[PDB]
Design a protein around this ligand. Structure first.
Ligand code: K
Ligand code: K
Ligand code: K
Ligand code: K
Ligand code: K
Ligand code: K
Ligand code: K
Ligand code: K
Ligand code: K
Ligand code: K
Ligand code: MG
Ligand code: MG
Ligand code: MG
Ligand code: MG
Ligand code: MG
Ligand code: MG
Ligand code: MG
Ligand code: MG
Ligand code: MG
Ligand code: MG
Ligand code: MG
Ligand code: MG
Ligand code: MG
Ligand code: MG
Ligand code: MG
Ligand code: MG
Ligand code: MG
Ligand code: MG
Ligand code: MG
Ligand code: MG
Ligand code: MG
Ligand code: MG
Ligand code: MG
Ligand code: MG
Ligand code: MG
Ligand code: MG
Ligand code: MG
Ligand code: MG
Ligand code: MG
Ligand code: MG
Ligand code: MG
Ligand code: MG
Ligand code: MG
Ligand code: MG
Ligand code: MG
Ligand code: MG
Ligand code: MG
Ligand code: MG
Ligand code: MG
Ligand code: MG
Ligand code: MG
Ligand code: MG
Ligand code: MG
Ligand code: MG
Ligand code: MG
Ligand code: MG
Ligand code: MG
Ligand code: NA
Ligand code: NA
Ligand code: NA
Ligand code: NA
Ligand code: NA
Ligand code: NA
Lengths: 114, 156, 64, 141
RNA sequence: UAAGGGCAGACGGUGGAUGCCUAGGCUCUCGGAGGCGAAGAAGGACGUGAUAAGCUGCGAAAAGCUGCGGGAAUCGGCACAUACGAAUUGAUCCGCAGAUAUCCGAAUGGGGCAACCCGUCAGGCCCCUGACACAUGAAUUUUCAUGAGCGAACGCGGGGAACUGAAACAUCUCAUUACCCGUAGGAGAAGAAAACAAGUGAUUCCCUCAGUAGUGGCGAGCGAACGGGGAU
RNA sequence: ACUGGAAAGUAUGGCCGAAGAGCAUGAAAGCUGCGUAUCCGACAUAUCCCUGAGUAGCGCGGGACACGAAUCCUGUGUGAAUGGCGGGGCCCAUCCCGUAAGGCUAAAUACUCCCGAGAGACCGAUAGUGAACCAGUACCGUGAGGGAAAGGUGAAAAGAACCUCGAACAGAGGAGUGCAAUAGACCCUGAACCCGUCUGCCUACAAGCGGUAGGAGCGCCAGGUGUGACUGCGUGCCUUUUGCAUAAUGAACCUACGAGUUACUGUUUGUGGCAAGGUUAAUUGUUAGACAAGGAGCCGAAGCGAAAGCGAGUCUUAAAAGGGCGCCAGUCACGAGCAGUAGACGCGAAACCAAGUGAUCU
RNA sequence: AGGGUAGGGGUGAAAGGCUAAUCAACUUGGAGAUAGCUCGUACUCCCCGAAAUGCAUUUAGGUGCAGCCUGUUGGAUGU
RNA sequence: UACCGAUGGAGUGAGGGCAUGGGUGCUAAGGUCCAUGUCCGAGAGGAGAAGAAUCCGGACCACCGGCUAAGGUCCCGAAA
RNA sequence: UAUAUCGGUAGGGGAGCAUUCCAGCGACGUAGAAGGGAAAAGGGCGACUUUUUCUGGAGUUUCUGGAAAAGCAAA
RNA sequence: AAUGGCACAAGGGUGCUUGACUGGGAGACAAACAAGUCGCACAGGUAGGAAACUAGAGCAUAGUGAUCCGGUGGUCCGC
């Protein structure tokens, strides 16, 4: 018998083209252009999921550095003192305390200020 | 390609026209061109061993017997063809709901004519029993002579 | 169509009992005073087809 | 099972290999053919007995021997199967229960150890000595 | 402040995809039949309707004429028509048998740029019209009979390539193929031993023997028969 | 009775069946129509002593036979016998078989322009014939020749009386028909590319494959959704390559079309049936593909030797195991992989050959 | 104006000119010639994973056999 | 921890850079021909501004957790 | 249950999804099929699959097995 | 030719000689294949020698080329 999968073949394209809405010009709707654009974006997304962790750690470190300099120390000295004293609070929590709970950050600094 | 009606003339000259190089009009790349690797006339019969076929037949019959769909009935004849009489026989044997297969020892033209118009009924001769026909019906009805013929002819 | 045996192979090779290919050594037809007696006898003896040349000899003999 | 729940034996049917149908299958693109050369082209075929131009083995080696036309080849039958047939008679040469209008030669590998008169087209000397020692006879006809 | 622009949604436009549908193809089976033509073919030209004819039918008797049988109320062919008539004293329609059947075309009275021009002899009209006859070739004895040309495949016969394969190429292969030409029939050809063999008993076809025996720049390749089992 | 524009649908309750094939009917009908099963029916016209002489044979040159020089054929030149003569793969002798130089002959075999009746795990309008329709047409060419595109209103034309704007149906807005007119003639459904309008957000200090990961504000409708100030990272894709952002190749875009298929024969393997055996082919019988027959043939069952031959041995040898090869579960299928022969994964030459058409240009 | 010469054939005050916009012809067929060459080869996920060397070749951008990969099996030996 | 037997299916037979030992060249070449390793080929991630094979390091997927390599800690740009 | 392993071109192996048709078994449909638009949810993973609504106005489909004209981004 | 070897000489003479043998190839080297290289044991019959022993050509490594078709000598099969 003769088999042509017209509906399935068209439905695959339509499903992918729902994902390329918002793109610029022909890259949103022209299919060969749109499908080309969408796959390069997927490679970018794989790379950026890895880079997001580095970016957020850098942001935490910068906020901790500013709060430590307000308290009288630097980031490297503060982190060395915390590691020596065995305090396991991570940089995300430390940055959150520095931004939003300065009294708690101050007590943490005063703990290792010796 | 060899069976299309177009001529074998080169459509465009080989070089210089600025488009794709082209041969004759029967190419599968062209609209209305050849069908590549389409169907060809075929014979689908193949061989199975005789002993394998006999084993399959006996397996189907054993499966019917184990699942308890075999009803042995007395031999009957009709003076004139009559669908209502055969319908009554099926109703009395309680086989008139689902598919039934009656197995007869010989032709019995009046019985065949009586059963012809009933939609869930099949007839077969005892000596022509095959696996597909036995398995395709929910209920199997045998006569005494049909049981004797099947026992004699399909044993072991 | 059925496979056709190679005529030269069918004139040059033979099957042994355990499915080996029997062959004759080929360096002894016409320059034999110069050669050595042990060399000539070893070329007289019937050899077998090497394993790497098998299945090619078999293709020539129609895998028989 | 009936026609509605048919099932082949496990591992009896296998799906065919389909090439040239995309990257995820592992069989698309060049479609298992490699890149270029003669073997990549449609209509390539191996020349049987060709080795690139070097003289092939089927021409390097010499022809030998001849085959006799009227070669009388016997079907071998041994003493062991003779005794097996004897232990359910004492008069062999039936041999249809084998051959099909053939010439039979009796050979000595097992042992007869019975008293049989065997008719056959040929015997070996060892077979004759064995059957006579066990107390038999030969009809070489 | 948006001249314009970007993205999204809604709603339209274009275009004609998709889904659904179709008697228009394709492959076959069984049974017939296997020709038409000088009593003018195949294939055409010109005509023909109440109204122009594109198809269809028909042929100056021109979408039709006659008879027999069947049948019983509509019919006057199709391209989205009306008028006007036919018809139970039986239309239309269907089966069978008849009548008519222009011109060209083997075309055959002579020519010719197919569908035209020009004739002769007898016969019936009045410069001109309607019905005949008037070709050739092999048989027959002026008479008679046949032939010619067209057309599906299958048959027999006369001529007969090359590309290609051999990893070049010349023997060889492709292939006694393509193709051209001639000529039958329902089939044709073959067929009744100056035979095969080392017992069989005319041809033909099928299954084996067998990719065997052989053949071959003994390369590429090619490739039986006897015997046995059947159809008959 | 219900739903519906309309029942053949669904739910009840009945009936026919040698008829539950099908097609049509306002949706899907055994009981509405034509039909179907079954039975009946033709005025015609068709069909059913003699025994084969330019021979047999022979030389030269060729051909056909599976065969590239026995049997068969013959262009050229010759040339018998009448118990005799011919063949058995070259020639001789024996043996065997046959009786040339005359003819006819059914069946089993090959085929399908045509007619009748059937069928399909064949296509369904870029498919299937080139041709579902105006098709070998339109068109192209001096000619031979080449050769398209083009199906669908609605159940029924009921195919929109009449009104309004406008010179006009050019077109539209109404009214009316209709289940529906966003079914209004290019008329079923009505996708993409491509083109517009409206609404929301953003945008005139900004610089690279246009995304991706973060992230305010605004706007819609209860934690969803549109937009995106600003920030980080980022030289498309394919192919060919040692190596391509490459200034190497390729594509305007979209929809549709487009390339490892089938047959036969081998081989390996997964799974099976039987098993020292396994298996039938062609074909035949019964009823109508199924069941049964059909053992011819093939493979296995013993090897060694070129072979005669011998045999769990055998070859080599004067002889020695001194050496070689052997002794010390198959077969038939189904599925899959691979190979060869076929156009053999698809498209593409320049050429070669055969038969025709052209000197209206030159 | 009419006619004649037709394919490697005609014709050529000779340029390999011309032979229907085609000349170291056209149409149809053999025919899907052949192309060791270029280009192209379409659904998904999982496991493994090379080579660009040697030998030979009218061979050198091709191919045969080794080398190196993979599946399935039986042995012990590999680093 | 996967080396050999036998079998089914291959692809490859245009290589390249670096280090080392050499020939050739001019102790030239991003040159050319061998040998021994290694990497690119077929390999993403980090540093070097940006670089096929130099330095570090072999990516099952997710994470807004932690420790390190080479290399760094004035700002662009993480850390004196 | 543990341990180990899971970058990949040529290439080998394994397991699946969709499409057209068929057999058997179930089902759906004018109280609205296929197709077309929008929206939501799902899958060791994926090919893909369900559901709601508008358009549409007549057919479609589940499971098991069978067979292929069985999947496009570049020629 | 070159390289390696060679004093018990493998270098140089004398005498006798034909082992420049027949049937052979445990086991190895080398190797894509085809090819190539070294080498038995024992039997038969010899040469040298008092005997033990040695002798299947040469100090070694180049001195050639398949198959098909033909010629010569010896000794199983087709009509
Ligand atoms: K690709
Ligand atoms: K050569
Ligand atoms: K409509
Ligand atoms: K409709
Ligand atoms: K539209
Ligand atoms: K951006
Ligand atoms: K270029
Ligand atoms: K050479
Ligand atoms: K190299
Ligand atoms: K459908
Ligand atoms: Mg990290
Ligand atoms: Mg052609
Ligand atoms: Mg077509
Ligand atoms: Mg296909
Ligand atoms: Mg791969
Ligand atoms: Mg290759
Ligand atoms: Mg390629
Ligand atoms: Mg290459
Ligand atoms: Mg080709
Ligand atoms: Mg706007
Ligand atoms: Mg739209
Ligand atoms: Mg008249
Ligand atoms: Mg005339
Ligand atoms: Mg050639
Ligand atoms: Mg009805
Ligand atoms: Mg068409
Ligand atoms: Mg106007
Ligand atoms: Mg609408
Ligand atoms: Mg419409
Ligand atoms: Mg500025
Ligand atoms: Mg601004
Ligand atoms: Mg380059
Ligand atoms: Mg780059
Ligand atoms: Mg190129
Ligand atoms: Mg371009
Ligand atoms: Mg480019
Ligand atoms: Mg593209
Ligand atoms: Mg395109
Ligand atoms: Mg010149
Ligand atoms: Mg010209
Ligand atoms: Mg050809
Ligand atoms: Mg071609
Ligand atoms: Mg080739
Ligand atoms: Mg791996
Ligand atoms: Mg190879
Ligand atoms: Mg090479
Ligand atoms: Mg190389
Ligand atoms: Mg270099
Ligand atoms: Mg590469
Ligand atoms: Mg690597
Ligand atoms: Mg640290
Ligand atoms: Mg910093
Ligand atoms: Mg890893
Ligand atoms: Mg992987
Ligand atoms: Mg609805
Ligand atoms: Mg396809
Ligand atoms: Mg597509
Ligand atoms: Na704007
Ligand atoms: Na005339
Ligand atoms: Na309807
Ligand atoms: Na109007
Ligand atoms: Na372009
Ligand atoms: Na696979």
């Amino acid at each position: 018998p003769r088999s042509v999968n017209h509906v399935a073949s068209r439905a695959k394209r339509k499903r992918i083209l729902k994902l390329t809405r918002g793109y610029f010009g022909a890259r949103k709707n022209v299919w060969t252009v749109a499908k080309n654009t969408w796959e390069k974006g997927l490679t970018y997304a794989y790379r950026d999921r890895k880079s997001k962790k580095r970016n957020f750690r850098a942001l935490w470190i910068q906020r901790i550095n500013a709060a430590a300099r307000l308290e009288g120390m630097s980031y490297s000295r503060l982190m060395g003192a915390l590691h020596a004293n065995g305090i396991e609070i991570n940089r995300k929590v430390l940055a959150d305390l520095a931004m939003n709970h300065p009294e708690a950050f101050r007590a943490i600094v005063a703990k290792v200020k010796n | 390609r060899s069976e299309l009606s177009g001529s074998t003339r080169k459509l465009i000259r080989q070089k210089g026209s600025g488009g794709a190089r082209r041969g004759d009009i029967n190419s599968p790349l062209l609209s209305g061109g050849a069908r590549v690797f389409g169907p060809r006339p075929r014979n689908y019969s193949f061989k199975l061993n005789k002993k394998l076929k006999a084993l399959a037949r006996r397996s189907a019959l054993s499966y019917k017997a184990k699942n308890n769909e075999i009803i042995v009935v007395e031999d009957f004849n009709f003076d004139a063809p009559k669908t209502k009489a055969f319908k009554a026989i099926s109703a009395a044997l309680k086989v008139g709901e689902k598919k039934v297969l009656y197995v007869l020892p010989e032709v019995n033209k009046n019985v065949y004519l009586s059963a012809r118009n009933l939609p869930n009924t099949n007839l077969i001769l005892a000596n022509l029993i095959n696996t597909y026909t036995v398995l395709a019906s929910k209920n199997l009805v045998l006569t005494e002579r049909s049981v004797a013929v099947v026992n004699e002819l399909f044993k072991a | 169509p059925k496979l056709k045996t190679n005529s030269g192979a069918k004139k040059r090779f033979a099957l042994t009992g355990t499915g080996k290919i029997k062959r004759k050594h080929a360096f002894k037809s016409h320059i034999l005073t110069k050669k050595t007696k042990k060399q000539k006898r070893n070329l007289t003896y019937f050899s077998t087809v090497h394993k790497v040349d098998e299945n090619a000899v078999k293709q020539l003999l129609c895998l028989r | 099972m009936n026609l509605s729940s048919l099932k082949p034996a496990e591992g009896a049917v296998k799906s065919r290999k389909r090439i040239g149908r995309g990257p995820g299958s592992g069989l698309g693109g060049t479609s298992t053919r490699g890149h270029k050369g003669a073997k990549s082209r449609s209509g390539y075929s191996k020349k049987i007995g060709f080795e690139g131009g070097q003289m092939p083995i089927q021409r390097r080696l010499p022809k030998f021997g001849f085959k006799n036309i009227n070669r009388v080849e016997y079907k071998p039958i041994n003493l062991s199967v003779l005794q097996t047939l004897s232990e359910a008679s004492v008069e062999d040469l039936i041999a249809a229960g084998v051959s099909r209008n053939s010439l039979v030669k009796i050979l000595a590998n097992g042992t007869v150890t019975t008293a049989l008169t065997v008719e056959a087209h040929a015997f070996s000397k060892t077979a004759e000595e064995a059957i006579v020692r066990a107390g038999g006879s030969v009809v070489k006809l």
